[PDB]
């Protein structure tokens, strides 16, 4: 079987990154012990088994130029992938602004819009989409990277309840999502306008969405951030502009308050298509 790993030739090589349960690593798998073997990216839980297990199963049926490529497992459970050496965009993007215009972040925004409608064509919320969850194939591709949080909607309904939202990035949400815990494509559809302007402003942690809604709710509210959140979106504000009038129309397209006004990806990927030719 090409998809089972052993784990006495998974040899670690360093770290990639970590969230507060997982943990992805740069592993060789060298059957032969001699370092010639392939270079893989080991998704593994921290010392949620469940979730894990359910998300292997996910990635392993999912086949898209813009999603990351399921390798196989190391079974206690790893999930390995295909190794992207340049990383997420969130690091890529400050690092590389003499490389990226305006015009290859439109072909980003299009290659994330392709994989998120693929999702969703599967019955699929992905409910964790930001900068840090796609992946630099190169200067010319990217791939949704992560689905952590990925949830199937249920047959002959339109979302998945959220029992636990412990480690939710708020300031990704839609308005749904942080009164309910309901979770809807329109949901993902939102989350996408905020990775957009993530995009645009090359992922500056000085104007992250969490930095500029901040600025606007007050920093002061503790408890309260969440409430005073959702008032801000409820009186029609949002994210500002980065410092391209017709790419900010289809970013406020996502921020529609009720989910049924907001667009579909394969609506999105028309107006981005429009603007490219
Ligand atoms: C700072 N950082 C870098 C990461 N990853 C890579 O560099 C990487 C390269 N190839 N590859 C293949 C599949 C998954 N990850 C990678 C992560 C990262 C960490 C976690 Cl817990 C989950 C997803 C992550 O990646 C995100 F982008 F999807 N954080």
Redesign the pocket.
Known sequence: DPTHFEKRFLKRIRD????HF???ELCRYDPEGDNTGEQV?V?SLKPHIADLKKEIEILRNLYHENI?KYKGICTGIKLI????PS??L??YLPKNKNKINLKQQLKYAVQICKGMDYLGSRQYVHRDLAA????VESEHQVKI??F?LTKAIETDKEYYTVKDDRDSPVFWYAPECLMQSKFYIASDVWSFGVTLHELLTYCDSDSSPMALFLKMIGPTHGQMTVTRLVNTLKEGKRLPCPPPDEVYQLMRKCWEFQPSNRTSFQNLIEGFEALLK
């Open positions: 990639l990154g970590e969230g997982g943990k992805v990216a998704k990351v992938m295909e190794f992207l990383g997420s969130k690091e840090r969850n796609v992946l990277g992560d952590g």
